[model samples]
Target: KKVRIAFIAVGLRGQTHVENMARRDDVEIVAFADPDPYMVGRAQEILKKNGKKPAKVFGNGNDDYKNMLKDKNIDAVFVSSPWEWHHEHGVAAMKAGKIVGMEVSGAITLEECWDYVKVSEQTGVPLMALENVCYRRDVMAILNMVRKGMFGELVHGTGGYQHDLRPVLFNSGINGKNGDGVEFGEKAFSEAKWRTNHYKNRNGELYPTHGVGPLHTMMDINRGNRLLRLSSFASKARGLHKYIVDKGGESHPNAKVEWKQGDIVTTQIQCHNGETIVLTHDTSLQRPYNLGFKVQGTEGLWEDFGWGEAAQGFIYFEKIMNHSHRWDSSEKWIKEYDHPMWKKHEQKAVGAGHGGMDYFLDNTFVECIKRNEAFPLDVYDLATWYSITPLSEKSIAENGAVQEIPDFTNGKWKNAKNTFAINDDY
Candidate 1:
C-alpha cells in the first residue's frame, strides 16, 4: 500500500525530495521524467544508494513525462520542473488520474494557475502546491499559536522570497552546475539551470510562495477569507546588471542582455477580511536569504527581520504571562508548540533541505494521497498565490493601481476552516 510516486524533475530542487523520500516506506519512487539524462541517472543513483531499485526513467519522446503519468502503478506525480512546465505537467498528471504536486517558484502565470484549478475540478483529481515554507519549524509553531488565538484577530502579515541569488542567476551554462554559485565565474543558468530565463523578462511578485505561503496559511486565506486588491511596484533594475558589469564591464555579452525583471518588486495586497499583506521580490542583489516575514495580530505575531544570516523567527505576545512588546526567541516555544509531526520527526527531518521542511511537506503530501483527502494548499490557494505575479505586472504597468483578486473558490471560503490536521502520524 505504498504511495507509489513518479517525478518529472529530480535534479535542480527535486533531487532533495528524492533523497528525502528514499527513506520513507510510505512512498515508492516508481518512475521519473527529466529531459536531462544526467539528472535522471543521478536520481537512480540516489535510489540505489538507499537500497531501492531505480524506477522507470522517461525522456525519449517529445513528452516523455506522459509515460510516467500513464503508469498505472504510480499514485501521484510531483514536478519541480521549470515554471513554464507546471501547467502542462500538472494538468497532464491530473488528467492521467494521478494526484499532482506542483513546486511553483515564481508567480506562476494566471492562466496556468486556472488550468490546474479547472483540470482538477473537472477531473476530480486532487492537486497541491508543495509549498514547504508552511511546514517550516518556525512557521508551524506560529500556526499553532495563531490557531490557539494567541495571535488574536490577525491584523496583517508580510513576507517575500528575497534571497540574494545574484550568483545563481548569473552563472548559466558554465560548469553544468546550476548554482553552488556562491563563488563567482559561474554564469547564470547553465545547462542545469533553466530558471534563469524566467527572471530575464518577468516582473512582479515572481517568486511568491515561500514568502507568502505560511503567512497566507496563518491568515487562513482561501478558507475564511480572500484577497481582494493588490498593488505592485518595482525598484530600478541594478543587481543583475551590476553583477554582469563587475564580471566583464559593459562590454560583456550579458551586459547588453536585458534583464527585464527589476532588482526589487514590492506588492501590497488587501484581503476582504481587513487584512493587508506586503510581499517583496529581491533576488538579484547582495542580501541574505530571508522571507522578510512578520505575521501580526492584536495579541501577538511572529517576526523575522530582513538582514539575518538565515530565516529565523521570534514571537511577541502582548499581555500574555504579563508580557509586553518584547520579542521572545521562537526556540523558547518550539518544544511546546511544534507541530505534532515535527516533534516526532525532528530527528529524521534533518538535512532534507531548507531546514528539513521539505520532509514534512513530502510526508504530508504522501499521507494525504494515501488517504484520499484534499491537500491543505489546494487549487484555491495556488490560484490566489500565483495570481500575484500577473496582477502585480498589471498593477505596476498601471502605476500601481489596485487590482482586484479573483475568488477561485466561488465564495466557498466563508465556512472553509482549514481541515488539514496531524492524525497520529507520530
Candidate 2:
C-alpha cells in the first residue's frame, strides 16, 4: 500500500521533495499545489524524468492549495512553501485529515505554534517537522554516542545557521546557477521573492530549527525534557546593506531601505532537565557554511568545524586523551559510533540532498504514515522548535529579557518516550 502524497507549493524546496518522493516505490506523487506555473511545470518534468505518473497540479492561485487538501486520494501533504505559510498549510492539512511533512522554519508568532498543536490534537493527524539537519550523518553518530553515554550527563549544546546567504537574500549570485540581481520580492526568484522581506521588518533568531532540532533529539526535547525559557541578542544590521552598496552601488534605490534584521543573532535556551542550548543565526555575515555544533557533558565534548564532515570536527575526553587536554579528529570517533540507520542506508542515500539527510527525513515521514505509527518529530516538536523565533523576537525587543517557553505537550513530556532513531526500523 503506497502512501499517496500531495505537495503544497512546489518551488525550489518543494520540487526537491517531489523529486525525492518520485523515486520511491512506496510513495505515489498524486498532486501538487503552487501558484507559480513555472514551478508546476518543473514538478511535472521531474515526474516524467523519474518515470512516475503525472501529478494533478493546482496552479490557479495562492489559495488553491485549500482545494488540493480536499482531495480524498492524498494521504499526506508536504508543506514546502515559504516560511510564513508553514503554519497555515500544516493546520489546514491536519484539519482536512491529511498527514503533514512540514519544512523547517521559525513561527511568525507564538500563537502559530499552539495552533499547530491544537489542530493536530483535534484532528488526530500527525505533522512531522522536516528538519533534515537532525538526520545529517555525523550528527546522527554524535546522537548515537550521546545515547550510549559517551557524553555523560549532558551540560550544554551549541549550534547555529552560520552560512553566508547574501546571494540568496539579495538574488545577486557570483555563481551562474543562482540569479544575478540585487532585486527581491516581486522582481526576484525563488527564496528572494518572499524570504528577503522578513529581513526588512524583523530581528531575532529567524532560523532556529536547523540547529536546535538536532540538539533536541539528543537532549530529549518534547519527549522527556522541554525548552523552558529563552533570551536573545542581535548584532547591528549591516551585512545586507553592505552587499547592496558593494554590488548595486550606493546610488541603488534599495540602499535607501533599512534592514531590521541583524547580521548575527544569538539566542540562549534553558531546558527543563538542567541543560542549556545556544543557537546562533549568522546568515547575512561573510562566512563559510557551518552550523557550529558542540555537545558538551561532564564526561567530554564534541565540536563541529564543518557542516557534517567528520574530518573537520574535534572530540575530547579525559580518559581517551590521558588528561593531555588535546582534541582528536572526529572522523574515527564518528565512524566508530556511526548511527545504525546511516550504516544501513548510507549507500542508498548517496545522491539525496544535504548529504543524504533529506532521504532519511523523507523516508521516515512516509514510513510512519504507512505503518500507522507516530512521527518521531511530531507536532509537539514542531511547536517547541518553531516558537523560538517569535519568543526570541520578544526577548530581544525587551532588551534580552527572558521569555518563558510554553510546554505545548500539556505536561505529557514527563512521560513521553524518546523513540527517535532508537533502532534502524524507521
Index of the highest-lDDT prediction? 2
Best by TM-score: 2
TM-score of each: 0.92, 0.97
- Each prediction's total of clashing residue pairs, residues at least 3 apart in sequence or on different chains, is 13, 0
User: Per-residue CA lDDT of candidate 2, range 233-284, in tens?
Assistant: 9989988988888888999888888999988899999999999999999988
Residue pairs with clashing backbones, model 2: none
Error of 2 at 351 (Å): 6.3
User: Model 1, 260-345: lDDT tens per residue?
Assistant: 78888998888888999999998888876778888899988778864321235687777774665577776666557777777767
